[PDB]
Design a protein around this nucleic acid. Structure first.
Ligand SMILES: CCCCCCCCO[C@@H]1O[C@H](CO)[C@@H](O)[C@H](O)[C@H]1O
Lengths: 274, 276
DNA sequence: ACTGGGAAGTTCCAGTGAT
DNA sequence: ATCACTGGAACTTCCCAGT
C-alpha cells in the first residue's frame, strides 16, 4: 500500500460557502497555516509512489457515515460537484489552489443528493438508505481519493483520506468568533465595570464572554436582551479571584460559544488594584 | 371562527414513555398544576361555541414542520395512535383524564410513520417529502383538533392547537435536575474545597454547579473527566465574593444546565472565615 | 386569525490587490 | 487598468409569541 498523507489541512473557520447566484466559482480554500503574507493551500503527500495517476476530491459529511455532501466543489478541474485532475507525474506533494465550496439551497437538497448518486460520488459506498435524513449544511470534509498505477499500468485506488471539517462563515452557529472593539481593556478587581463589545455576528442564546488566567476563570454578566442585533454585547466584568490587588494582573477575555466550545482569539484585559 | 385554547397544559416532565413490550396502561398525562391532593388533567376551552362536537388528539413533533410523531397515544378512546371522542354539548371546558404515551422502537419507525399517513393522521398536512428529517423520540406535543358545527349546522374543523412539549424522563438533556447526596456543605471563603456530589443522570458536557447569593454568582470548578458515569461530580468550590469573612455566610448551591438554563432545587452551603 | 418583530436563508454589490 | 474575490448590505422566508 502506497498511501496519502495530508501535509496541509484546510483552514476550518473564516470562509463563506457561496451560492450559485454569487458566481461560477467560490474562491479558494486556504490551508490552516495561511496568513496575510504567506498564504497556503490544502496539500497532500503520496507515500510510496511517484508517476502518473488521478486525484479526486469530494465533499462528505462531517460525521460518520461519511455520506456525499449536497454541496459542491467548484473551480479549476471541478465538474459535477467534485475535483478531478491528473496527478503531476514528477512530484509526490500536491497542492490544490482553486477549491471553492458552493452551497446548495435547502429546497434543492433532494436533487443535489440525486446528482451525487448518479455521478458515482460516494467515496465510502454508503447504502442509499442512509442518504435520506438530516444534513449539516454548515460543515463539510474534503475526501481525497488517489488512484495510482501498478507496474503494468493497472489502476490501484488508495484508501480515501478525510480532512478536518470546514465550517461556513456565513452561517449562524459556525462563524469565526471575533471581538472587533471594546470601550476599555482594564478595570477594578471588584468587577462591575460596564463593557461595550463589538463583535462579528453571534446568536444571543449561544454566547458568553469568558475571562481566564492561571487557574482562574469567570464570566461576563449579561442577559440575552443585552445582545444588540447579534453584533454588540453590553456586559459587566466579573470580580477577579482576589478582590484586593497588590499590582495589576493581566487576563484573557474571549467570546465563547457554549454549543461547540469554540473561542475567539483572546483580548488582553488588565485588572487594577482597589 | 370559534377557536381552541389550552387552559391546563400537560405537565412537561416526570413521565416515562412506555414500550409496547411493557404491556401496561402507559399511565395518564397529568396537568401542569397537578399535585397529589388535587389531580388535574390536560384541559381545553372552546371559545365561541357550546354545542355538539368532537375532538381528536394526536402527537406531533416538537419542532416545525409539525409532522405526526411516530409515538402513539394509548388509553380509553384511543386507536391507531390518536384519541377521538365527543365533547359535552352543555359545556365549553373539556379535560382528558387517560392520555398515555407509548414509544415506538427505532426499528419500527418507518412502519409507524406509514400508519400515521394511512390513517390520515397529519394535522398540518405536511408533505411526505418533509417527513424525512430525523425525529426526536424523547419529545412530543399534543395536537388538539376540534370539530364543531357552524350556525347552519354543518361540520367545522377549528384550527389545530399545540401543547407545550412533553419529555420522556429517560432523556438527561430535558430531565429535572436533582442533587441526591453531597459530602460537604461548608468550606473556606477562599474556595478550593473538594466536593463529591451524587445526582440524577446528567450529560457531562452540559452541567454546572452554580453558587448564588444576593448579587453574587460563581461556579464550581471541574472537567468532563470529573463527571463519573453521569451521576457523580467531583468539583472544587469557587472563592466567595469576600475573602475576609469574619463569620459564616449562607449561600445557595444548585445544579444548572447551561443549554436550557434549568436549575435544581437549592441547597444551603456555608462559606466560613479562613484563619490559617 | 391576526400582529409585531428578530433572525435565518438567499441575493446583490462596491471596492479592489497581487500575481 | 482587469476581474475573480472580499466582506458589507439588502432582500426574502421563517418562526415565536403574544391579543
Ligand atoms: C372585545 C374583545 C372580543 C374578542 C376580539 C375578537 C375575537 C378574538 O380575538 C382574538 O382571537 C384569538 C383566537 O384566534 C384569541 O386567541 C385572542 O386572544 C383574541 O384576542
Amino acid at each position: 500500500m502506497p498511501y496519502v498523507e495530508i501535509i496541509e489541512q484546510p483552514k476550518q473557520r473564516g470562509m463563506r460557502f457561496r451560492y450559485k447566484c454569487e458566481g461560477r466559482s467560490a474562491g479558494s480554500i486556504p490551508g490552516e497555516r495561511s496568513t496575510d503574507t504567506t498564504k497556503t493551500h490544502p496539500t497532500i503527500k503520496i507515500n510510496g509512489y511517484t508517476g502518473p495517476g488521478t486525484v479526486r476530491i469530494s465533499l462528505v459529511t462531517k460525521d460518520p457515515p461519511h455520506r456525499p455532501h449536497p454541496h459542491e466543489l467548484v473551480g479549476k478541474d471541478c465538474r459535477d460537484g467534485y475535483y478531478e485532475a491528473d496527478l503531476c507525474p514528477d512530484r509526490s506533494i500536491h497542492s490544490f489552489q482553486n477549491l471553492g465550496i458552493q452551497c446548495v439551497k435547502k429546497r434543492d437538497l433532494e436533487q443535489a443528493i440525486s446528482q451525487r448518486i448518479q455521478t458515482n460520488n460516494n467515496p465510502f459506498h454508503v447504502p442509499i438508505e442512509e442518504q435520506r435524513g438530516d444534513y449539516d449544511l454548515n460543515a463539510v470534509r474534503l475526501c481525497f481519493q488517489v488512484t495510482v498505477r501498478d507496474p503494468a499500468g493497472r489502476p490501484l485506488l488508495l484508501t480515501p483520506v478525510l480532512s478536518h471539517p470546514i465550517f461556513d462563515n456565513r452561517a449562524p452557529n459556525t462563524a469565526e468568533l471575533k471581538i472587533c472593539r471594546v470601550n476599555r481593556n482594564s478595570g477594578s478587581c471588584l468587577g462591575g465595570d460596564e463593557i461595550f463589545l463589538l463583535c462579528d455576528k453571534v446568536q444571543k442564546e449561544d454566547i458568553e464572554v469568558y475571562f481566564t488566567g492561571p487557574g482562574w476563570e469567570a464570566r461576563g454578566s449579561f442577559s440575552q436582551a443585552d445582545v444588540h442585533r447579534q453584533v454588540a454585547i453590553v456586559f459587566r466584568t466579573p470580580p477577579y479571584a482576589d478582590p484586593s490587588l497588590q499590582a495589576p494582573v493581566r487576563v484573557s477575555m474571549q467570546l465563547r460559544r457554549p454549543s461547540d466550545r469554540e473561542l475567539s482569539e483572546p483580548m488582553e484585559f488588565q485588572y487594577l488594584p482597589d
